[PDB]
Design a protein around this ligand. Structure first.
Ligand SMILES: OC[C@H]1O[C@H](O[C@H]2[C@H](O)[C@@H](O)[C@@H](O)O[C@@H]2CO)[C@H](O)[C@@H](O)[C@@H]1O
Ligand SMILES: OC[C@H]1O[C@H](O[C@H]2[C@H](O)[C@@H](O)[C@@H](O)O[C@@H]2CO)[C@H](O)[C@@H](O)[C@@H]1O
Lengths: 436, 437
DNA sequence: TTGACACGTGTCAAA
DNA sequence: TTGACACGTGTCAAA
């Protein structure tokens, strides 16, 4: 729970949380406010469960796509930076964090997936997904593999699903059609089918996750991985000479990654809303602030103009933004959570062979549009069945007390029902078959 | 994931030296040509029973010995058949830790006990008792620091204090553990948990403090003390902290009694590489060079291998570990241990957060720790009885609806069919179901 | 031990 | 949209 005078921050465990803790420390020495940074597991899921009751951190860091739902639920404090501060950031990073006309978080950095490759094993990375199988057969003879990346999170597979035409929610007339899903069209199918065939032909393992892929690449066992800018520092500490480049094409079309905007939202339940703005605006979103974080784990293309003109000169950032130009900014609508869950189930289920690609994506389609039942809807159902049982119970209480039926000492209401049937001229067999 | 012939896949917890173990796998691969993959998935001790039931899961699984009896009872593990010669290379009591129903069910690797870890520069003289920790915290807070921080989300770390004044899991008597004699609700257990909850109430600790929050604060020099196992020393070493490892503090004048774990390696009963796994474990891992490679990554504690433990026992930190281990007890490996752990975890978390009182949390924990898990057949008995109860009712109402002629609306529920039946039989049924003649 | 009935959410469908 | 009945596990009790 939040309490006046201190600041607690939640950020994902793959971001530079020590670097950010360094920013809170300098914030503590200047103002005397202690700042604790924490990287709990599944924080994008825990926050909406505890913020409702008033708990959660002061600030929550995540990509912009989850913030619309948070705001829809009233969990986020409206952000109102002065004009002078708004002009410090690229306008399009502000667009990413505006929901229903209001700013619901501070944008931090732009993230896109790129192809990361081992220049020593692979001086010339492939330009196409199609040549990866042959490349893997060649490397497998030397004890290596072509490509490993996280298959448990649809974020990493979506660039390939969207290459040939797959899309989450169609954008038309200036809006997102919560009810036009493109996870089951020919383009999406072709992409997921190629990925599953990679597994069938034993070029990838269905159970490969984030840490397995990162280990294999950082140890030099795989020639390529797909990851974001946060991964670079761990490769830097390794003996691998890597390059960051454009993702491969599929059927001649570019891979289209979903582009994330790492953002910091303020808990509407927080008693330190002003202290959090002072920290975010005048400590984190500064050259020295982002630098301290970026030096920990690279941020990507930061939203702060003054510091991005520097980072934009890193060829790895230029490749990140090359991939981001071919991708799309993720929607922030509340249904993005349902989209991500459904597509996650589809990828995992087709990769494992539990479902065909057709069946997996067919179900993902309906799931990604499925509306979550409201609290009142659940309560209507719960009360109806309560009522249904209470009415029956009172009828059988009456039959038992006044029926004077020949019932055993202990018997269920089916037996009472039977004695009521017999009384009313009915015959009831052992299995319930009933007639006059 | 399924195990494939000619390959080895290993599961080991993320806080152990899985990079060192991979190096051992790399040697195995070089001498025999068998690839070895080390993974450290989350919640592996829960995932293994789920996947292994159908033949999935890794070839080898590393965990403390307390989970393995349940795996064996479920048929998930291969019987370990080390020649008498090889068994004599490990301390007998480590073999006891992995013996279940007379059979050995895993290779013991290392002995783990929690110790008190303190910052020599902030705290040259560590406290001897839990009681003096609140005063110590008051001093340090005036310097911007705290006295003690440790994982409150896993009961393993709080159990030494709960056991100190008398708490216990399952009573040992007549050469076996009594599954119906649980001691998480006696006066000793209540005193221990009450003192911990008082630390939180008095702002000396945070209820939400987990493993990484505690590790980060100690390793960054914000708290003078932590409680942890040997695996944690290497991260402290790389930090700027000058630390010692010593005996846990006493509570009510009695020693803290940590539950002692034996990190152990079981072989998946479904593995077609049982021989390769035995070769890797017996002749590559459980060797001086093998455990050295793992121990270099993250300290194993006091290894089961006699030859190499004579080297590790020279380390004062191991001497402190074993001092605490002598004061604790080897964990049971009985299947009921998972239920004991879940119960105590819920009690500790609910008490520390104020969601439940100590007495009420521990009362529920006692019932839960002793509760027998219903068998598959018990569940199936219940499921089929209710299926049959509904099927009989549905046939009756199907017959009432077909031959009744009760004059019912197009759509109505069986309560209305019942009501019609009642009036046909000379009854009157009110709106809420009130029924009489 | 077995077993009556409660419980809230799932499946299927009419509208 | 609301709503019938299914569904398996929980609560409570008799023995
Ligand atoms: O996999 C679905 C997941 O994708 C995105 O999450 C990214 C996140 O943006 C990155 O910062 C990084 O941590 O990797 C994540 C993928 O594991 C979405 O932002 C997220 O909402 C979604 O669940
Ligand atoms: O907290 C309950 C938990 O305790 C033990 O787990 C230890 C494990 O023994 C150590 O090796 C280390 O990893 O820390 C763990 C606690 O986080 C039991 O072995 C385990 O079964 C039990 O659930």
């Amino acid at each position: 729970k939040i309490e006046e005078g201190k600041l607690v921050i939640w950020i994902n465990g793959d971001k530079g949380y020590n670097g950010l803790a360094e920013v809170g420390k300098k914030f503590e020495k200047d103002t005397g406010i202690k700042v604790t940074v924490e990287h709990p597991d599944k924080l994008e899921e825990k926050f909406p469960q505890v913020a409702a009751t008033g708990d959660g951190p002061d600030i929550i860091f995540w990509a912009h796509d989850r913030f619309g739902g948070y705001a829809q639920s009233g969990l986020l404090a409206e952000i109102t930076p002065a004009a002078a501060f708004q002009d410090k950031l690229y306008p399009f990073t502000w667009d990413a964090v505006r929901y229903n006309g209001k700013l619901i978080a501070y944008p931090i950095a732009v993230e896109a997936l790129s192809l990361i490759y081992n220049k020593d094993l692979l001086p010339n990375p492939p330009k196409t997904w199609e040549e990866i199988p042959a490349l893997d057969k060649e490397l497998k003879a030397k004890g290596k593999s072509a490509l490993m990346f996280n298959l448990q999170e649809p974020y990493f597979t979506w660039p390939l699903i969207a290459a040939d035409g797959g899309y989450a929610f169609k954008y038309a007339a200036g809006k997102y059609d919560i009810k036009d899903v493109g996870v089951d069209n020919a383009g999406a199918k072709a992409g997921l089918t190629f990925l599953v065939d990679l597994i069938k032909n034993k070029h990838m393992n269905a159970d490969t996750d984030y840490s397995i892929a990162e280990a294999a690449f950082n140890k030099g066992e795989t020639a390529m991985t797909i990851n974001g800018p946060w991964a670079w520092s761990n490769i830097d500490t390794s003996a691998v000479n890597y390059g960051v480049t454009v993702l491969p094409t599929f059927k001649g079309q570019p891979s289209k990654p979903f582009v994330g905007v790492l953002s910091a939202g303020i808990n509407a339940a927080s008693p330190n809303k002003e202290l959090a703005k002072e920290f975010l605006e005048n400590y984190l979103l500064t050259d020295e602030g982002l630098e301290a974080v970026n030096k920990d784990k690279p941020l990507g293309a930061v939203a702060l103009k003054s510091y991005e003109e520097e980072l934009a000169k890193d060829p790895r950032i230029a490749a990140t933004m090359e991939n981001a130009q071919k991708g799309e900014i993720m929607p922030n609508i509340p249904q993005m959570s349902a989209f991500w869950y459904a597509v996650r189930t589809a990828v995992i289920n087709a990769a494992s062979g539990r479902q065909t690609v057709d069946a997996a994506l067919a179900a993902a389609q309906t799931n990604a549009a499925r509306r979550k039942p409201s609290w009142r809807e659940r309560e209507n159902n719960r009360r109806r069945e309560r009522r249904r049982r209470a009415v029956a119970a009172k009828i059988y209480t009456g039959l038992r007390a006044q029926g004077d039926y020949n019932l055993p000492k202990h018997c269920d209401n089916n037996e009472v029902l039977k004695a009521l049937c017999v009384e009313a001229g009915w015959v009831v067999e052992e299995d319930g078959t009933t007639y006059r």
